[PDB]
């Protein structure tokens, strides 16, 4: 198990623009489009995005792209953020991909805003982290991902993937 196989289970992937769990314009693997009720406006960042008129609809292998651009976006923004690289570097590799997981999810700024949460992952306090993190909207509005990468802080291994 990886970072991208992982979000590929979560994300799932869609060749056709979507909406996601919020209602927003989405395409591929997670890949959010724009905040905007405008469907046009979704066309044409995708076409920004893919470098081509795409009509709305996408190949494999542009969904690909835009995917590993975005892990690699977020992993770029944790090691720039002052609150996520200490935590970063503190954890082990398995715990690592699903700090990588949230912020890909919520955004930089969604998980820095997680404050005890993570002085507790620091700490390696596991069960009291797991506690606090499902005490979040995020839990409330998607439970099964959050049971998912909640159990994977408390345990250290893939099992709720396997």
């Given amino acids: 198990m990886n970072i991208f196989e992982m979000l590929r289970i979560d994300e799932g992937l869609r060749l056709k623009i979507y909406k996601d769990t919020e209602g927003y314009y989405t395409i591929g693997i997670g890949h959010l489009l724009t905040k905007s ?43 720039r953020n002052a609150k996520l690289k200490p935590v970063y570097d503190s954890l082990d590799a398995v715990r690592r991909a699903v700090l990588i997981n949230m912020v890909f999810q919520m955004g930089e700024t969604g998980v820095a805003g997680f ?48």
């Fill in 37 to 79: 009720p405008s469907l046009n406006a979704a066309k044409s960042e995708l076409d920004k995005a893919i470098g081509r008129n795409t009509n709305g609809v996408i190949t494999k292998d542009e969904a690909e792209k835009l995917f590993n651009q975005d892990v690699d976006a977020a992993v770029r923004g944790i090691l």
């Fill in 115 to 162: 404050t005890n949460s993570l002085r507790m992952l620091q700490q390696k306090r596991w069960d009291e982290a797991a506690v606090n993190l499902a005490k979040s909207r995020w839990y409330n509005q998607t439970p099964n991902r959050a049971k998912r990468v909640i159990t994977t802080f408390r345990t250290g291994t893939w099992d709720a993937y396997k």
